[PDB]
Every structure is written in C-alpha cells, then in structure tokens.
C-alpha cells in the first residue's frame, strides 16, 4: 500500500534532439515539485524529474539512449517479482533496457513491468510496459531485459509528476 503526492503541469518546452530527450513543465518547487518524482502521461511512466526550479521542472524522458537515473522497476513473472533498474533505451529496436536484476527467474515476453519504488524514485506500481525479451540470458550477473513502453509523450501537453508522500518508506 502506498501514499503519493502529485502535480500536473503544462509542457512548455520539448527537446528536438535525439541525444537529450526531455520536457520542461511550467510548475516547480513553489507548487510542490520534488526531486523524487516520476513523470506520467497516458497512464504510464514517461520519465523522471531531473531538475526542479522554483517555477519549472525538467523531465528526462525514458527514450534517452543512456539513462543515469537508476529508476527502479519490477517485472512480474507469474507469482514472482524481479527487480532491476532502467539503464537506457535502444532507439533502433524501440525498447527500454533494464539490468541489475535481483533474480534468475525465467522472464517471458508479455510479463508486466511497473516501477519498483526502490532507490531515489521511490514510487512503485506505475505502469512501464511489457517484456519483449532477455539477452545475455546465461550471464552470471548481466542478464538484461528489453521492454516495450506502454506510454509516450507524443501529442501530450500535460504531464503528471508523482512522488511518494511518506517520510520514510519502510
């Protein structure tokens, strides 16, 4: 069970370059934007807050080639859950990349991926997408998962920021 705080704001800038995909929203700290927040559109995860200013917020999109934000995700495979982190996006195969998996459970195409709530972006259960496949599948530590995103920001002009409202989740 979870408690969240949210803030919906207009998109006022969108980067036109593939090498830094981001949006600027017309709210920030003065209206409650926080650095733990994730960003949603169309019911699903579209990015993470990368900077909060007094009256604006920059959101780093999930379609960036490399992603340093260590966004926690989890994958449901029947009755087991596998945690990992988002590490980037393959623009030529149109899939999100996840690694640092906490399990050697089987992972199958169609398995649902949601936010995990660990680390800095500590809000769980936001839809991310569905598994396409795994690669490096027999590696001791470095199995990776590719995921088809269920949401994007195409023709979206309002984004919802969401953060955990509990002081110390535990």
UniProtKB/Swiss-Prot annotation:
Domain of life the protein comes from: Bacteria
Topological type in the membrane: Single-pass membrane protein
Shown part of the complete sequence: 108 to 272 of 272
Family: Belongs to the MreC family.
Organism: Streptococcus pneumoniae (strain ATCC BAA-255 / R6)
Oligomer status and interactors: Homodimer. Interacts with a number of proteins in the elongasome, including PBP1a (pbpA), PBP1b, PBP2a, PBP2b (penA), StkP, MltG, MreD and RodZ.
One cellular-component annotation, GO: plasma membrane
Its biological purpose: Involved in formation and maintenance of cell shape, probably part of the elongasome which synthesizes peripheral peptidoglycan (PG).
Name this polypeptide is given: Cell shape-determining protein MreC
Keywords from the UniProt entry: Cell membrane, Cell shape, Coiled coil, Membrane, Transmembrane, Transmembrane helix
GO BP terms: regulation of cell shape
Domain comment as written in the entry: Deletion of the C-terminus (residues 183-272, CTD) suppresses activating mutations in khpB (also called eloR/jag); the deletion no longer interacts with MreD and interacts less efficiently with PBP1b and StkP, CTD deletion leads to increased phosphorylation of KhpB.
Phenotype on disruption: Cell shape does not change, cells start autolysing earlier. Neither PBP2b (penA) nor rodA can be deleted when this gene is absent.
UniProt entry tagged with the keyword Cell cycle: no
Subcellular location: Cell membrane
Topological domain ranges for the Extracellular compartment: 1-165
